[PDB]
Amino acid sequence: RKRIHIGPGRAFYTTK
């Protein structure tokens, strides 16, 4: 369920 990815303006940080 958790997802964390940071690229060239591609935020994908989700913990909750």
CA dihedral 6, 9, 15, 16 (to 10 degrees): 170
Residue 16: partners with Cβ closer than 8 Å, 6 or more residues away: 2
Both tokens of 3, joined, read 């997802």
SS3 3: strand
